Amino acid sequence: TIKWIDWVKQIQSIAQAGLTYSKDVYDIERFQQLRDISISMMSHYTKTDWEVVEKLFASETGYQTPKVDIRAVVFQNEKLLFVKEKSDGKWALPGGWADVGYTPTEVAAKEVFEETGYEVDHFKLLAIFDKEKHQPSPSATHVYKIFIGCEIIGGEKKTSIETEEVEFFGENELPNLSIARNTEDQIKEMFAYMKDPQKEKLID
Amino acid sequence: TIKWIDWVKQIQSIAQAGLTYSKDVYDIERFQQLRDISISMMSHYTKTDWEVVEKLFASETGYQTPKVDIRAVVFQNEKLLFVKEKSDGKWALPGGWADVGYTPTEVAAKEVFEETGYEVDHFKLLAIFDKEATHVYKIFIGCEIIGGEKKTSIETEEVEFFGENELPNLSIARNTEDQIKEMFAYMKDPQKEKLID
Ligand SMILES: O=C[C@H](O)[C@H](O)[C@H](O)CO
């Protein structure tokens, strides 16, 4: 693996904590210098514009925790609901970044409605995966993925600008997965839950 | 001209100054973390440059989400592990902010070890709460003592196990009275539906 990336992510994290919590004017200035070195290291070794890296890597406030992604797990006739993005042509469970000001089930409901047309409720906590644990490639960011089971209670299948196709798929007919949005192993775990819904919940 | 070497040397020299001159216990710990990382970095890549990773930011947008707090839920014969906090002198489950570089269960095991000296395993996902300027998803993770011993701290003045009717004064930001009640409900009925806000 690339060892340097996880070191630099930890330096930015501590610098971000220092800028939030230090009250010492010379320590605040040391934490700002350290964040700026972290941007410069990322900028040079990924050949990415310095100011772009600052926005993508080093503009959060407060203590730095992993980011939260939500995936909705909706079955019908033992087939799992997937949505295809028009631009990249790849498939994933409905979901996305958790919006500030929304609870996890509100994110699941809103993402399912916007991407698929369906109304959902009857939320179940299924799993929390650590995106980095067996990640294919190195990442600038650390993500926890919360999988929430839901029941379709209304609305109707509807495509959009972003969302070209909405379809259910059986476990021996999976479409081309967006590995960034969901791994094969995360999908296999959801079919294991469908077969035995009283099973232990996966937490990385 | 191998640029990582001068940047790591700068990080080291800043961290050493911070470590020498800070009077705040939390500032000292941050500078100690940075010193520790810089040592680890220098002890690698002897001759070579760092690998260029030109695709690292391809799908990155700088989107901000709720922060993650983790609370470890540790029972011993029907009593729940609490910790008296230096901040307010009130009591809470071991836990805190989830750190970059750690899985949820590594966070739970780490917070329990540093705050109480116990080593835990057998992790179970119990709940995620959020009652909606700071937005927080709080993950309750159950686990069991497999080793270590009870050790109080400069940070953690007392470590006590408490039953449902003898609860100490709770640090309410860290754990509400309803969140603790729910945890006792999981211990008593261990097939209760897991809560997710
Ligand atoms: O919240 C957790 C943090 O470690 C502490 O609040 C910081 O060290 C700031 O003092």
Residue numbers in the entry:
A (entry chain A): 2 to 205
B (entry chain B): 2 to 133, 141 to 205
Text lifted from the article:
B. cereus CDP-Chase is a member of the Nudix hydrolase superfamily, which are a family of enzymes that hydrolyze nucleoside diphosphates linked to some other moiety, x. It is a bifunctional enzyme that can hydrolyze CDP-choline with the typical nudix reaction in addition to a non-nudix exonuclease reaction on RNA. Although its endogenous substrate is CDP-choline, CDP-Chase can also hydrolyze other nudix substrates including ADP-ribose. Data for the B. cereus CDP-Choline Pyrophosphatase (CDP-Chase) crystals were collected on a larger, single crystal (60 × 30 × 20 µm) using vector collection, and the smaller crystals were used for a multicrystal approach for direct comparison (see Section 2.2.1). For the single crystal, the data were indexed, integrated, and scaled with FastDP to a resolution of 2.08 Å with 〈I/σ(I)〉 of 2.6. Cocrystals grown in the presence of ADP-ribose, a suboptimal substrate for CDP-Chase, do not show electron density for the complete substrate molecule or the expected product of hydrolysis, phosphoribose. Electron density observed in the active site was consistent with separate ribose and phosphate molecules. The ribose was bound directly by B-R31 and formed water-mediated interactions with B-W98 and A-Y22. When cocrystallized with ADP-ribose, loops A&B 86-91 and B159-164 become ordered, while the loop B133-142 becomes disordered. Overall, the ordering of previously disordered loops and the sizable changes in the conformations of other key catalytic loops suggests that these crystals have captured another catalytically relevant snapshot of CDP-Chase, most likely the active conformation.
